Amino acid sequence: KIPRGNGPYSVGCTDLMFDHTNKGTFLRLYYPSQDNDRLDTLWIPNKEYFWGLSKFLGTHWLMGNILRLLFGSMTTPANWNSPLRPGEKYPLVVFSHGLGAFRTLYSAIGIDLASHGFIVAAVEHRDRSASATYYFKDQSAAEIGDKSWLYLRTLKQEEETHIRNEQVRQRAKECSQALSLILDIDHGKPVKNALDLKFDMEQLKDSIDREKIAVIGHSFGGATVIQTLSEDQRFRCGIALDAWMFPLGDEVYSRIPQPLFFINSEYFQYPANIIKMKKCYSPDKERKMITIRGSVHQNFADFTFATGKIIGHMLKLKGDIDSNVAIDLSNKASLAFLQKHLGLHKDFDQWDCLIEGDDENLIPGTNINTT
Ligand SMILES: Cc1ccccc1-c1cc(C(=O)N2CC=CC2)ccc1C
Ligand SMILES: [Ca+2]
Ligand SMILES: [Cl-]
């Protein structure tokens, strides 16, 4: 089971596509909900995601159908299409996924942020870093649910530097565009969802705390945080979860005024990556780093809960640390950080020592020795 949120609020979930094109916004939305009696949300909702996942794991079209058999009915503990909880302005997180992932695969983070009173826009990237995504060729395809599938792009060694930077840059623009879309919805603009779903987008009118916006992401999404913050001053802080810094151009590192928090795993990180994180440090800027002890790259993704301990460890989805333990540390430190830098008036400051990695499962800064 993906763990339920630890915060006071019930959690809802819906999908938003606007516009219907490969250049429009695709996001999954987690939000505080009025009721707690809807059906749970389908974790991986289409078979083409499983196919895109098999291709990414380097297996047959056939193995994709085996993953669909084992995982195709799995839900996440979010009320599918619940009415949004009224009477409060919610701060907003935009979430960017890792390479080979897509919008649905960080529900343990998205569900927990929402239970504490956030709206979470987990975006699906059309940069061919997702395992699979979809859009509609035109208005007619949009209406009759004729989906066009975009699958993960495999690079040559040659293409790496250039293409990953193009992608981190498209990701940033997709984060900005997702933010602009939500703000318009808030500012009352009627948007016709390209997906026919029994959730009225009008509910979101006057629901956003327009000044309290952050960008969070994992892996490629960690670099998306950094690129995003450098382009969009609307994002007031960022949290890079096990950032893979390689996509970033040399120019970004000196150009991030916003508070920025690195939550790293113990076993992913490496000198070249840490050095790139250090390139972001400055005395005039807010910068914080923790390492979760006993943890691995996928400890931030839902895959960490998808299996038992032995299969999980073998496939590098679980570490020596319990997954709920590791996600609680990441989520709770995130909560305290977001409170500090968005000016929230909640109890998240109860977790301030986590920002400094004062905990037995936390390392202050990094374990990685450099120069
Ligand atoms: C556990 C799981 C459930 C359903 C679909 C895929 C997977 C899976 C996932 C990864 C993984 O670590 N990934 C990170 C990004 C994309 C896949 C590795 C192996 C498997 C079997
Ligand atoms: Ca901009
Ligand atoms: Cl790892």
Curated annotation (Swiss-Prot):
> GO annotations under biological process?
lipid oxidation; low-density lipoprotein particle remodeling; peptide hormone processing; phosphatidylcholine catabolic process; plasma lipoprotein particle oxidation; platelet activating factor catabolic process; platelet activating factor metabolic process; positive regulation of inflammatory response
In UniProt terms, what function does this protein have?
Lipoprotein-associated calcium-independent phospholipase A2 involved in phospholipid catabolism during inflammatory and oxidative stress response. At the lipid-aqueous interface, hydrolyzes the ester bond of fatty acyl group attached at sn-2 position of phospholipids (phospholipase A2 activity). Specifically targets phospholipids with a short-chain fatty acyl group at sn-2 position. Can hydrolyze phospholipids with long fatty acyl chains, only if they carry oxidized functional groups.
EC numbers, comma separated: 3.1.1.47
What result is annotated for mutating residue 151 to A?
Answer: Impairs the association with LDL particles
Give the UniProt subcellular location, in the record's own words: Secreted, Extracellular space
Q: Which disease is it linked to?
A: Platelet-activating factor acetylhydrolase deficiency: An enzymatic deficiency that results in exacerbated bodily response to inflammatory agents. It can be associated with several disease states including inflammatory gastrointestinal disorders, asthma and atopy. Asthmatic individuals with PAFAD may manifest aggravated respiratory symptoms.
Full-protein residues shown:
55 to 425 of 441
The top EC class is hydrolase
UniProt-reported outcome of changing residue 225 to F: In PAFAD; loss of function; risk factor for coronary arthery disease and stroke
The protein, known as: Platelet-activating factor acetylhydrolase
* A molecular function (GO) term: calcium-independent phospholipase A2 activity
Q: What triggers production of this protein? A: Up-regulated upon monocyte differentiation toward macrophage lineage.
- Outcome of mutating residue 227 to R, per the record? In PAFAD; loss of function
Q: GO cellular-component terms in the record?
A: extracellular region; high-density lipoprotein particle; low-density lipoprotein particle
Mainly resides where?
A: secreted
Which residues are named in the active-site annotation? 219, 242, 297
Which tissue types show expression of this protein? Plasma. Secreted by macrophages (at protein level).
* KW Signal (keyword) present: yes
Recite the UniProt keywords alphabetically: Asthma, Disease variant, Glycoprotein, HDL, Hydrolase, LDL, Lipid degradation, Lipid metabolism, Phospholipid degradation, Phospholipid metabolism, Secreted, Signal
| Domain of life from the UniProt record | Eukaryota
Q: Which reaction does it catalyse?
A: a 1-O-alkyl-2-acetyl-sn-glycero-3-phosphocholine + H2O = a 1-O-alkyl-sn-glycero-3-phosphocholine + acetate + H(+); 1-O-decyl-2-acetyl-sn-glycero-3-phosphocholine + H2O = 1-O-decyl-sn-glycero-3-phosphocholine + acetate + H(+); 1-O-dodecyl-2-acetyl-sn-glycero-3-phosphocholine + H2O = 1-O-dodecyl-sn-glycero-3-phosphocholine + acetate + H(+); 1-O-tetradecyl-2-acetyl-sn-glycero-3-phosphocholine + H2O = 1-O-tetradecyl-sn-glycero-3-phosphocholine + acetate + H(+)
Effect after changing residue 232 to A = Almost no activity
